[PDB]
Amino acid sequence: PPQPRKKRPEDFKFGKILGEGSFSTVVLARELATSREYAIKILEKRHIIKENKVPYVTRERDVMSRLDHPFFVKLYFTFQDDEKLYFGLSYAKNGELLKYIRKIGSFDETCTRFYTAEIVSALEYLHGKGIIHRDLKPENILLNEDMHIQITDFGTAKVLSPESKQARANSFVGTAQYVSPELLTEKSACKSSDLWALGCIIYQLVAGLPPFRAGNEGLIFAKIIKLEYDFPEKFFPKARDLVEKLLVLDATKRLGCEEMEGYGPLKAHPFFESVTWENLHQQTPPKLT
Ligand SMILES: Nc1ncnc2c1ncn2[C@@H]1O[C@H](COP(=O)(O)OP(=O)(O)OP(=O)(O)O)[C@@H](O)[C@H]1O
Ligand SMILES: O=S(=O)(Nc1nc2ccc(Cl)cc2s1)c1cc2ccccc2s1
Numbered sequence: 001p002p003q004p005r006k007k008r009p010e011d012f013k014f015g016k017i018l019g020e021g022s023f024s025t026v027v028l029a030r031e032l033a034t035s036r037e038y039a040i041k042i043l044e045k046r047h048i049i050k051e052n053k054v055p056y057v058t059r060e061r062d063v064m065s066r067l068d069h070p071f072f073v074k075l076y077f078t079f080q081d082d083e084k085l086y087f088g089l090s091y092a093k094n095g096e097l098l099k100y101i102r103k104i105g106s107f108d109e110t111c112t113r114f115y116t117a118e119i120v121s122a123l124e125y126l127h128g129k130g131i132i133h134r135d136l137k138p139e140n141i142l143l144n145e146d147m148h149i150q151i152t153d154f155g156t157a158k159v160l161s162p163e164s165k166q167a168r169a170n171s172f173v174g175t176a177q178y179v180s181p182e183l184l185t186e187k188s189a190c191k192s193s194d195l196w197a198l199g200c201i202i203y204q205l206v207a208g209l210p211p212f213r214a215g216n217e218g219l220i221f222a223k224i225i226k227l228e229y230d231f232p233e234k235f236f237p238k239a240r241d242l243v244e245k246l247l248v249l250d251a252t253k254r255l256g257c258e259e260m261e262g263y264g265p266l267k268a269h270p271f272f273e274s275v276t277w278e279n280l281h282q283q284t285p286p287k288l289t
Contacts, residue, residue, distance in 0.1 A: 007031075007079045007088065012040065018091075023053050028091065038076065041087040045080075057085060060155035063131060070281040071122035073142060073152040092142035092150040100288050101138055107205040109236045110286045116202050116242075117275045118149045120256070123198065124263040127191045130160040132169055134189055136197035137178045138204065147285040158189075167191075167258075176217040177210045181225050182251045192257035199246030199254075206239055207232050211247065225249075238271040245269070 012029040018039055019026050029040045048054055064075035064087075077088040097115070101107070107115070119141065126133060133140075133151070140153040156173035160166040168188040174180075178200050180193035204210040211229035214220045223229065227249055231240055245255040252259035256266035267277055276283070 007077055009081060009086070023048050023051060037091045039089040039091040041089055043085040045083055045085060056155040059157065061087070063154040063157045063159060066129060066159070069122065069125045071118055071149050071151060073150045090150065093145045094143035094147060096139050097141040097143060097149070098138035101204060101208065104288055106208050107288070111288055112202065112205045112236065112239060113271060113275065114286050115149065115205065117272060117277065118280055119198060119201065120266060121277065121280055122149065122151050123194055130162060132158045132160065132189055132191050133194050134158060134173050135175055136194050136201065137175050138201060148281050176220045177212060179224065180251065181249050184221050184225055190251055192251040192254050195246050195254045195256045199243050202239060203243050206235055242269050242271045
């Protein structure tokens with residue numbers, strides 16, 4: 001069918017900068033005709049052309065256009081003018097999960113469980129569509145007005161080809177603290193690489209910092225491939241067990257991966273015993289304190 005009229009910059013009143021990326025800026029904007037607020041990601045054409053970033057922009061648009069699930073930032077529209085590309089995104093009013101980890105220091109068990117469950121639910125959806133995120137981290141897990149998660153940053157995601165039953169992706173992307181050992185050693189990532197990142201994130205929610213810590217990337221890489229980390233005291237025992245079943249060097253042995261028979265066993269883990277999985281995005285999140 002036809003679609004709505006293509007939008008233009010003059011259709012919006014732009015407000016504050018929400019954040020700045022290496023080759024993008026996200027600005028809060030109100031659509032004049034509706035009074036709706038959007039986070040509009042803006043890229044300068046000559047800059048991403050000069051700096052060979054066009055593939056990432058195309059990737060972000062293509063991957064986001066495939067998503068239809070409440071735990072992801074939504075791509076509503078795109079438009080361009082002579083100088084710029086514009087992505088109209090849902091506005092995640094409460095910002096990055098990382099902000100809350102820093103502020104509060106350590107999530108309690110109820111909050112760790114709830115937010116872990118939402119991330120697991122989101123990954124189940126993404127992996128079911130054959131998509132690897134590859135840069136899952138608290139900075140990329142935003143929070144909407146109701147404090148549900150909104151995962152973002154899909155420019156470095158990968159749609160695995162169904163036609164070839166593709167399992168491995170060859171682009172080297174990610175963030176050192178959360179990068180999987182297989183990417184470092186085998187030079188490819190798989191869906192299970194996101195489960196490794198999940199393990200790091202669960203650890204971080206409880207411990208306050210992610211498990212592989214150092215002042216530079218190479219030192220972090222060295223720890224990752226040796227599985228060199230420890231748990232702080234008082235780390236919730238069932239959460240520790242879960243993390244130990246995710247932070248596994250062999251990607252085929254991580255709870256939740258295809259070779260471990262998928263998300264059923266992961267959702268069945270004792271840490272999640274009280275979770276109602278079916279309708280998390282309609283549940284009231286526990287207050288973060
Ligand atoms: N949909 C959104 N709603 C609210 N805030 C957002 C949204 N998308 C991004 N932001 C904020 O804007 C910041 C900049 O995002 P952008 O994707 O342009 O760069 P980045 O991913 O932070 O940086 P880099 O691309 O260099 O890794 C984000 O870190 C986030 O805090
Ligand atoms: O189909 S696209 O891949 N075409 C593109 N045209 C350009 C032009 C200049 C630059 Cl720097 C990148 C792209 S890429 C595309 C359009 C668009 C608009 C807004 C947000 C993302 C994208 S991707």
